[PDB]
């Protein structure tokens, strides 16, 4: 009967939509995690840049 076929087809849609939602949720979480790791990496990089500049000024002659 058509009703049973419709139920099966809608089940196919439901699982596919859930898969799509899971991918999007992971994508958002991955973006947040990488950005946090990126931010802390920048914090160390700028600190190193300041420290090397201070060392160069301390050692530069003239």
């Amino acid at each position: 009967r058509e009703i049973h076929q419709d139920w099966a087809n809608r089940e196919y849609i439901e699982i596919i939509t859930s898969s799509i939602k899971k991918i999007a949720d992971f994508l958002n979480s991955f973006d947040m995690s990488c950005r946090s790791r990126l931010a802390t990496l920048n914090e160390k990089l700028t600190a190193l840049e300041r420290r090397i500049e201070y060392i160069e000024a301390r050692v530069t002659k003239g």
Binding site: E43, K44, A47, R50, R51, Y54, A57, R58, T60
Partner: protein, 78 residues
């Protein structure tokens, strides 16, 4: 600057204030990143790029002008 605007007896005050600043830097470094206290102190004392800082210059200036011709020694009490 506050030390530079007073006599040689403000050395104790400068050391105490410097200790407070160092401790504050240590407390802030717990959650933030900051340059070492020694580098900042040298930056404020103009000692990073020069052999001598401001504190020593003021001490020499005070000795020449005020301390030497306005103080009497007592060897019993040093």
């Amino acid at each position: 600057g506050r030390f530079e605007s007073e006599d040689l007896t403000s050395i104790v005050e400068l050391d105490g204030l410097l200790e407070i600043n160092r401790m504050t830097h240590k407390l802030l470094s717990r959650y933030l990143t900051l340059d070492g206290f020694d580098a900042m102190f040298r930056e404020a004392n103009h000692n990073v790029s020069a052999p001598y800082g401001r504190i020593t210059l003021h001490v020499f200036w005070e000795l020449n002008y005020d301390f030497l011709p306005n103080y009497c020694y007592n060897g019993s009490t040093n």
